[PDB]
Amino acid sequence: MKRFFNRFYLDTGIIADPSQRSLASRVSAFLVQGAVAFSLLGTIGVDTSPLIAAAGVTGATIGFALKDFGTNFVASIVLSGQQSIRTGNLVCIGTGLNVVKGKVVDWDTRYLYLRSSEGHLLHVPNNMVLNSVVTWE
Amino acid sequence: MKRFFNRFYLDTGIIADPSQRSLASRVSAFLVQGAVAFSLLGTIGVDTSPLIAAAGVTGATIGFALKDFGTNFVASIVLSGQQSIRTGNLVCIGTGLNVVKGKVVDWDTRYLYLRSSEGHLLHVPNNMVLNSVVTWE
Amino acid sequence: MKRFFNRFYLDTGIIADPSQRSLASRVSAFLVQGAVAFSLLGTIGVDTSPLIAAAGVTGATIGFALKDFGTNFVASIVLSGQQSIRTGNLVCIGTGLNVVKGKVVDWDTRYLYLRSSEGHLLHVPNNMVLNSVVTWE
Amino acid sequence: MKRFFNRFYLDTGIIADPSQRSLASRVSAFLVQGAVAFSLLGTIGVDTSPLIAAAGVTGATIGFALKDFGTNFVASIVLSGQQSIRTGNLVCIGTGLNVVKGKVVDWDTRYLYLRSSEGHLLHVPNNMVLNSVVTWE
Amino acid sequence: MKRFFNRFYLDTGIIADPSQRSLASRVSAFLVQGAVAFSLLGTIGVDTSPLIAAAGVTGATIGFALKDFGTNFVASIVLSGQQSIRTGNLVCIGTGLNVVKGKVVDWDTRYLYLRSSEGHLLHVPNNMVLNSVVTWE
Amino acid sequence: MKRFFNRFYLDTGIIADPSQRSLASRVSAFLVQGAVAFSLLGTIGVDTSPLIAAAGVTGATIGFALKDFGTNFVASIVLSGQQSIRTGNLVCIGTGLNVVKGKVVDWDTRYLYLRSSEGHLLHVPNNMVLNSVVTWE
Amino acid sequence: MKRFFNRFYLDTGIIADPSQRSLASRVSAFLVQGAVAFSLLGTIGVDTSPLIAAAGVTGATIGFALKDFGTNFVASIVLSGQQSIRTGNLVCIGTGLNVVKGKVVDWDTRYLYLRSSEGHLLHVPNNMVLNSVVTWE
């Protein structure tokens, strides 16, 4: 099932990095196998309420822990295929005192790199880029 | 069922982009078929509690991840048919220091494009347009 | 049941717009018929846990998506029958830098229209009008 | 049961307005009768899981929609019997730039009316009065 | 059971006001009797799912409504036995522009009374006193 | 079981104050005995759904009420064994206008005491110390 | 199972500190053994609903209490393998008035240490480093 999940993530374009793709495929395969094993164990008569409760609590805790990284990855996926944010475009993010000015040099799944006027490298999180006034000159 | 969902989204006007419409139709059809298969499997006697718990946890996590994009799409759908926000209207969004001034040029489902006085293209998220003082001159 | 729901929304005064009233009546009738059909299907023995879980997840996601519009509609309903906010009253909303000044010209279920001193049309969301210091001169 | 609920709300002092009291009594009576009917229907064998799920989802959505009005009403109920906020007392609410100055003239369940020095009528929400530094001169 | 709850709240020191103590005792006794009656009704065979769902929804709504008052009461209970906040101590609460300066005169379960330099009576909520920099001179 | 819980809290180092330790031990012992009694009552056939629902609602309400105190205690436990925050260290907490300057004199589970330059005693909550830029000179 | 969990945390790289690794391994082993014992007890017929409810409530309360520490640890894990934040790099975190300037000297799982120009040691939480504009000179 690992190969099937790898192919699915490759085709759907959710994850492009090979290492992240492999990790996600392994995690998904393990989760599916665990769910199937729990269902099979519950079919024959063995109680599964404590196991389900513990698994759900742990999964909810882990998901709440990874909220920022998940939001950043979702923003990176959504912002893909945007004409304004392209290498060589002098973009400007933010309104008021919290302003960011520079030129796009590279895109990542956790940060957006902008080259300042003095040469400093700015790491703007994609979540902040999503919920802000993006000005393209 | 894919064709039926495509027709429903076309008629109801929730989604107008053909690619987004096709993707939503495929996702909805897959979800409905999965729910029907799970119900059928639970009918004969096979336990479905772990499968339901895992599916619900994953769905909740994904839905919480896509909160910003969902809110933006809802704002884009709601703001449709508004007289103030039309091409050629010199609108002004925001009060205080966080002010945005320009002329509407194009509307998207993720951004609202305003042409500044100097020519810079402003990308105002529709969610911010919803919860702000919109001034039309 | 559509006619009964239409009459109920008309008499209770929750929704006054005919199009919104018809849409709400259709949605409510469909939801009630779906719930009755699901209950009938569960009565005879067919499992309904996956169907209920999927329906609840989808309903919760949609309800969370429409939070801003729902809040605005609730504020519009509540603010009805207020003496301060009436056509021709020079109201003033907000304290500090985020101040709004003008004369009320028209009321909507999504915006409150104020005519500025220079003639600009202000669209103040009803939710912001609810949770702010409203000054009537 | 409507008369019993009306008497209970009258004696307990939660609601004093006759129209609000009648509306709350009718809503409570309808809810209790619906719950009893659902319990009776579930007693004989008819499945009630879809009905309970739909009713709970709708009730949660409506309760979340009315959060601001509920909070304002609770603040109005709690602030009752306070010596500082009485007609003729030159109170002052807020610290910093968001300050409100005036004399109390009337009290409502949704707003607190203060007469400014120039004669403008201020409508301070009771929720803001609860969570603020109230200065009485 | 009312007397037992009254004695328990008196000994545990959670509530000291006789009227609040009596009200809490009555509410707790009613809740316990209702829970026992519901359990007894469910023991013999009568369905209790709709009753439990309605009671839980109503209780959750009421608890969410009273969040501010509950937080204030908890802060008042916790801040008890603090050396800094005592009658005659020139305390100072807040940092930056939102500063409060005065002398403690009396303590309540909803407000903290400070006498300003000019004689104005300040009502600082206990929740704000909990989460702020308290400066004692 | 009270002695066992007291020993466990003593060894694990979560609670060091003897009075808090005794109170926590008593509460934990009572909760465990109540849970065991409820499980035993449910084993023989007596319905426990209303009792479980009421207990869960009350526990959730109480836990949400004590959120600030719980967070402060957790911050106090976590910050233990930190070299920067020690008696005699001229620490500085906060950035911008909300700055706090002084010397550490004593540590508590609810406040952090700093001696100002003029002699005023500052009570900085541990939660604010956790989520702030701590500057040690 | 303690050794297996220790090996798993060592290989997966989630926890590198030996003491934290041992504590996490012990906690995970205890939780798994408790869940298995509860499932076995529920298999034979003994009711487990009160035990599951109490365990879930306690686990949720503890998880909500440790939210800040969990977020900080997740940020520390995610930020690993970042080129910008390395010893000897003059980084700058924050935009506007809340700015932090210094040179990275050491990295921890709870704080990020920066050496100021005057020699003061800055403790920037990793959570704030995640959601901020990181400027590398």
Author numbering:
A (entry chain F), B (entry chain G), C (entry chain A), D (entry chain B), E (entry chain C), F (entry chain D), ...: 1 to 137
Question: What does the publication say?
Answer:
Trypanosoma cruzi, the protozoan parasite causing Chagas disease, encodes a miniature MscS ortholog (TcMscS) critical for parasite development and infectivity. TcMscS contains a minimal portion of the canonical EcMscS fold yet maintains mechanosensitive channel activity, thus presenting a unique model system to assess the essential molecular determinants underlying mechanotransduction. By combining electrophysiology, single-particle cryo-EM, and all-atom molecular dynamics (MD) simulations, we show that TcMscS forms a heptameric channel with a central ion conduction path, but indeed lacks the side portals shared by other MscS-like channels. Strikingly, the presumed two TM helices are of insufficient length to fully cross an intact planar lipid membrane and thus induce drastic membrane deformation surrounding the channel.
Further examination of these TM3 kink regions allowed us to identify a point mutation, TcMscS C66L, that demonstrated higher tension sensitivity and sufficiently abolished channel inactivation in excised patches. The distinct inactivation processes occurred in the wild-type and mutant channels motivated us to also determine the cryo-EM structure of TcMscS C66L, which, surprisingly, was nearly identical to that of the wild type (root-mean-square deviations (RMSD) of ~0.4 Å for all Cα atoms, Fig. 2d). Thus, the structural basis underlying channel inactivation in TcMscS remains unclear. Nonetheless, these results demonstrate that the TM3 kink region in these MscS homologs critically regulates rates of channel inactivation and recovery. Moreover, the identical structures of the wild-type channel and a non-inactivating mutant, C66L, indicate that our cryo-EM structures unlikely represent an inactivated conformation. Inspired by these simulation results, we experimentally introduced the D47A mutation on the non-inactivating background C66L (D47A/C66L) and measured the activation pressure thresholds of C66L and D47A/C66L relative to that of the endogenous EcMscL channel. Consistently, the D47A/C66L mutant channel maintained the same unitary conductance (448.1 ± 11.5 pS, N = 5) as that of C66L, but was activated at a higher pressure threshold (PMscL/PD47A/C66L = 1.95 ± 0.51, N = 8) than C66L (PMscL/PC66L = 3.70 ± 1.24, N = 8).
